[PDB]
Amino acid sequence: INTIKLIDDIIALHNDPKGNKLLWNDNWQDKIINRDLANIFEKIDESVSELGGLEMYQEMVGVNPYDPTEPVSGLSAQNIFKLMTEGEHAVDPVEMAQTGKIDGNEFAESVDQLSSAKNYVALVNDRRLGHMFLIDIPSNDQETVGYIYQSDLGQGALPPLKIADWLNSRGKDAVSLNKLKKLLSREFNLLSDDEKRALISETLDIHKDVSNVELDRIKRDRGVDIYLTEYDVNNFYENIETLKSKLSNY
Amino acid sequence: MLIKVKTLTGKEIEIDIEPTDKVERIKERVEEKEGIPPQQQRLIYSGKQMNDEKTAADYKILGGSVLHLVLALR
Ligand SMILES: [Cl-]
Numbered sequence: 153i154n155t156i157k158l159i160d161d162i163i164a165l166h167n168d169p170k171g172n173k174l175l176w177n178d179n180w181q182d183k184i185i186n187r188d189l190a191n192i193f194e195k196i197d198e199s200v201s202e203l204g205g206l207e208m209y210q211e212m213v214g215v216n217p218y219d220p221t222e223p224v225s226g227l228s229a230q231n232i233f234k235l236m237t238e239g240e241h242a243v244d245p246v247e248m249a250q251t252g253k254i255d256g257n258e259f260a261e262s263v264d265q266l267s268s269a270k271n272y273v274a275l276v277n278d279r280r281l282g283h284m285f286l287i288d289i290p291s292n293d294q295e296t297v298g299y300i301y302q303s304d305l306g307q308g309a310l311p312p313l314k315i316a317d318w319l320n321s322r323g324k325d326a327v328s329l330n331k332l333k334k335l336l337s338r339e340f341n342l343l344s345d346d347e348k349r350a351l352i353s354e355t356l357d358i359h360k361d362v363s364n365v366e367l368d369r370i371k372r373d374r375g376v377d378i379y380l381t382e383y384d385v386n387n388f389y390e391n392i393e394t395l396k397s398k399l400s401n402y
Numbered sequence: 403m404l405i406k407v408k409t410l411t412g413k414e415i416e417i418d419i420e421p422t423d424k425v426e427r428i429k430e431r432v433e434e435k436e437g438i439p440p441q442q443q444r445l446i447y448s449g450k451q452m453n454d455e456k457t458a459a460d461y462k463i464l465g466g467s468v469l470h471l472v473l474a475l476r
Contacts, residue, residue: 215474218408226438
């Protein structure tokens with residue numbers, strides 16, 4: 153499997169209006185491949201009807217729900233997590249985050265014990281940043297590394313960030329375990345202000361720019377909540393193929 | 403008081419609130435169901451974006467009110 157291609161395929165689904173509706177739906181219980189464009193749109197229709205039609209719905213909510221969405225961080229991370237992790241059964245990322253949680257210290261203590269032959273993904277809920285993101289840690293025999301998949305509303309310490317803008321280049325940048333441990337563990341707390349801006353910008357800013365980090369918006373003394381799980385790259389590949397089919401067979 | 407929170411997709415969840423609750427509290431209740439950090443939730447009660455530091459009573463939110471959760475970049 154070409155992992156760089158999986159990411160380009162997510163971008164292509166995102167950029168397609170019906171691909172967008174499939175990817176960024178908010179049904180967490182059911183399999184992401186079970187999503188259905190006819191039902192999704194029916195449910196928008198009903199929703200708009202309750203408010204008295206599209207004109208008033210826009211006046212009252214401020215957006216047009218038929219338009220393609222740019223997902224905030226929890227919407228992109230939870231959905232890509234399902235796309236990666238689901239095989240025979242649905243994965244509920246809301247339930248799994250609450251029941252399978254480790255912190256940044258336990259993540260640092262344990263990543264070195266993961267299997268080389270296996271793929272893992274961390275769903276990270278960063279309570280310092282008020283931000284969710286994914287760390288893909290695919291099987292790599294030279295040196296295990298992580299890839300960050302994120303988007304951002306831009307209401308914390310970082311600027312607004314669109315999922316496809318991020319994925320095109322920065323989501324393909326590898327991040328050493330050394331650096332992920334520094335970001336996620338208690339080590340982060342001993343860093344100077346400049347060191348925090350450097351590390352957060354390196355890992356999380358599209359343009360790796362220190363002045364893009366508002367250090368005062370990072371909550372001091374907080375931690376991270378992580379759900380770490382193994383996944384099968386074939387499932388990530390085939391789920392994407394299944395969603396692409398929904399479009400090519402429409 | 404039972405209120406509804408409705409997303410762009412038309413998904414509905416029902417949340418139990420008190421009039422003394424801050425909008426921040428309501429977002430905590432949403433997070434229990436949806437996963438979404440409160441920092442990135444935008445809740446709209448019809449017409450205006452709700453500020454985290456004001457209360458349900460402040461917004462005079464009523465039984466049966468629908469709040470809209472917009473999970474999209476501005
Ligand atoms: Cl479909």
